[PDB]
Structure 1
């Protein structure tokens, strides 16, 4: 197998600290243009940052009582479609769609008109005056806490996870119609993650124990993965669509080759503590795991689409720098869409940029 030296580029150092949050950074997202990092924190704010300088350029306070242990900013993600300025934010039992005033008319109006056009498991509400001042354009109110949100590639649909909400633990929302639907009749376990396939009409649903793949067109289950863990935390799907990685609180990362077998192709043990995030690069043959030990591990993976060879996975680099706070370390991470750059969110109140 090739040495890391033969597998550059990959990140090896922290060049930039995004400093300002006054509480744990639970979630972060990079915008479609690859220039703007958004972060969500227990200090009750969402912030947007100029990625190469670390300069904070925007802040909105979504929770005025940030000391409240009952609800927090849980998950944020920029809409993936270019030039609409939309940021989705799950906080408590609500999803806000926010368009920050940092892009100008052509982009901001595109987002706002998209969200306004659409004008019972979930309710879609016009913002109050207080919410307008926070740059909220619409709010989707669910019955239970929303822990995870993920956009479909085309930027109209998004899926959310409400753990222990039974039949409505997984909801699919459609911005253009202000429509929320529960795709499933049956609740199978506590749901940890839900993600659309990169190009197939499929939804991947991660429970604590399994990953189930549904064909939304055929309306049927097509595969059930058996990772062999009791406490799955997150999944990501390889950009060419035939492989998956899964993190677990029991310190493992599982690679599943979806066509090869339902059990893990490879089990990676590179963390001393619970693994909170796994993330594929969208273009480069890289992925990462991030854990409560405060470390990020970076891997190479070559996938052989056509020929009878299984994936080649090579560890590249251990990234250290985040501080462990109350047994928590790196809470989230996301790759730049094009560069070998990784962004991480820390329990230590920082986000960080890791570069070559």
Structure 2
């Protein structure tokens, strides 16, 4: 009765009249006929076709995910007991030591299998300082060096701890200390913390990406305009900008797996610049407003884009500037998506605390579109402060996925 008119499909309350004589008259008969007459000559008539398709028919007939196994299905190891929230992850090329970085000003390394906090180092004495904190850490892809880059504030710190052994550590240190924004030799405190060299620009190092060559790496400096991206080389302690004029704020930048070009992931676009001539090779127009992280297939044939606005997209460098396919399923911002280095798999991370893993075949030369299908919904992360899986990295050779979250507890997932 409280409902308004025109939302009264049942225009009366059915009653169980025991006898025909008890049936009363109807006073609303005039109203119903009046409404029908008005609708007949006043209701706009629109021609339409009523759908009758099966509701489940819309689901694509993709191959069953269980037939594409193995893929991660459960969490097998947890790096609990962390003082701060693990913002970043870094798996070494050998896939033996997993480095972690948090806002507590301490970088911790956890074994992939045993999970023991073998080694630690402190970057900022003021762990509670809100001005700056550890932004990101990345292991050097080149082997036989064991160099861990640690981005804290403006200071980019290269760390070579005693984990890997004298000879490898000696080679790494010699690689770092070969020079005889600005580069400054480590101080006594930095040397005690195993910091081999310090690099500091004007802006903070919000992101970092290494190159397989083992010498070149790039950093992203938001709120820097022209200097939003800088290219650095360890072999000569030299810094250069990828191009003379960067436009807008930039979130991420990663080198091509083998080509001499650097991908720049602008706030709204992803662009390819050839470092040999510093010329804009191509521009990508993703179907998302604000990209979060950039990812490149190891074969270099397909690109993956992630966006904070609930959007994660698959990009093909040969199909068109627009994404090949747009995926939107997460309940919160997609923090990061990382390709698998060897296996044809990739997974996405979001602030909702749920991780998804997708199988993806990338034809090297066949003129066929890639086949990407979901495999399994991974759960176990705890959503805190509207945040979830801050970072996630796949194993260099196995189908295992490391994870990091705001709950001050990194995790590792295994089949």
- What are the superposed Cα offsets for residues 34-75 of structure 1, whole Å, 9 maximum, x if unpaired? 111000001111011111111110011111111111111111
The answer to whether the 8 Å contact 1:215/1:222 transfers is yes
Give SS of 1:69's match: coil
Aligned partners of 1:158, 1:187: CA distance in 2, in Å?
Answer: 18
Give SS of 1:100's match: coil
The answer to whether the 8 Å contact 1:277/1:331 transfers is yes
**Residue matched to 1:162:** 221
- What are the superposed Cα offsets for residues 231-272 of structure 1, whole Å, 9 maximum, x if unpaired? 210010011102111111111111001110100111112210
In the superposition, the TM-score normalised over structure 2's length comes to: 0.84
Aligned partners of 2:367, 2:311: CA distance in 1, in Å?
Answer: 27
Does residue 101 in structure 1 map to residue 162 in structure 2? yes
1:183 to partner: Cα distance: 2.0
Runs of 4+ residues over 6 Å off in structure 1: none
The answer to whether the 8 Å contact 2:84/2:104 transfers is yes
Give the number of the structure with larger relative contact order, counting CA–CA contacts within 8 Å between residues 6 or more apart: 1
Give SS of 1:176's match: coil
The answer to whether the 8 Å contact 2:382/2:407 transfers is yes
Aligned residue pairs, count: 354
The answer to whether the 8 Å contact 1:172/1:183 transfers is yes
Aligned partners of 1:257, 1:5: CA distance in 2, in Å?
Answer: 26
Aligned partners of 2:318, 2:403: CA distance in 1, in Å?
Answer: 31
The answer to whether the 8 Å contact 1:31/1:37 transfers is yes
**Residue matched to 1:72:** 133
The answer to whether the 8 Å contact 2:287/2:326 transfers is no
Give SS of 2:174's match: helix
1:329 to partner: Cα distance: 0.4
Give SS of 2:295's match: strand
- What are the superposed Cα offsets for residues 140-197 of structure 1, whole Å, 9 maximum, x if unpaired? 0110011111111111111111111121110000101010111211121111000000
The answer to whether the 8 Å contact 1:28/1:39 transfers is yes
The answer to whether the 8 Å contact 1:127/1:137 transfers is yes
The answer to whether the 8 Å contact 2:216/2:233 transfers is yes
Segments of 5+ residues of structure 2 without an aligned counterpart are 1-61
Give SS of 2:172's match: helix
1:228 to partner: Cα distance: 2.3
The answer to whether the 8 Å contact 1:278/1:288 transfers is yes
Give SS of 2:331's match: coil
- What are the superposed Cα offsets for residues 7-39 of structure 1, whole Å, 9 maximum, x if unpaired? 111101000001222121100110010111000
Of residues 351, 358, 366, the one that matches 1:292 is 351
What's the Cα RMSD here? 0.9
Aligned partners of 2:407, 2:389: CA distance in 1, in Å?
Answer: 8
Give SS of 1:6's match: helix
The answer to whether the 8 Å contact 1:209/1:228 transfers is no
1:219 to partner: Cα distance: 2.2
Aligned partners of 1:285, 1:218: CA distance in 2, in Å?
Answer: 33
292-301 or 226-235, larger mean C-alpha shift: 226-235
Give SS of 1:177's match: coil
Give SS of 1:184's match: coil
Give SS of 1:149's match: strand
Aligned partners of 2:212, 2:305: CA distance in 1, in Å?
Answer: 20
Does residue 323 in structure 1 map to residue 397 in structure 2? no
Aligned partners of 2:111, 2:393: CA distance in 1, in Å?
Answer: 15
1:99 to partner: Cα distance: 0.5
